[PDB]
């Protein structure tokens, strides 16, 4: 019981680390994507 308790605790900890590491970068990417639409939409009547 105790061995597994420790194992799963450590697993969840490392997973939290990895998930946060990915999440922060992807969130900043979302924000840049959003604001870059306003940057682009000065005369963006053509398709691209």
């Amino acid at each position: 019981n105790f061995e597994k308790i420790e194992n799963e605790l450590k697993e969840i900890n490392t997973n939290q680390e990895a998930l946060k590491r990915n999440f922060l970068e992807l969130t900043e990417l979302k924000f840049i994507l959003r604001k870059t639409q306003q940057f682009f939409d000065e005369m963006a009547d053509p398709d691209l």
Binding site: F40, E42, M43
Partner: protein, 57 residues
């Protein structure tokens, strides 16, 4: 303004794309003309030596 100027830059690069495409079109046309003109001169020579061959006959 920066956004308008940079969009005008995207237009500038589309102009560059047009220029390079024009270059490629010119090259293809000129190469085809070279091929055809060489073929026609070859035809002239072919007929000339046919005629000389028949004269010797």
């Amino acid at each position: 303004s920066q956004s308008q100027g940079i969009q005008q830059l995207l237009q500038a690069e589309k102009r560059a794309a047009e220029k390079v495409a024009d270059a490629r079109k010119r090259k293809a046309r000129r190469l085809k003309q070279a091929k055809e003109e060489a073929q026609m001169e070859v035809e002239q020579y072919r007929r000339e030596r046919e005629q000389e061959f028949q004269s010797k006959q």
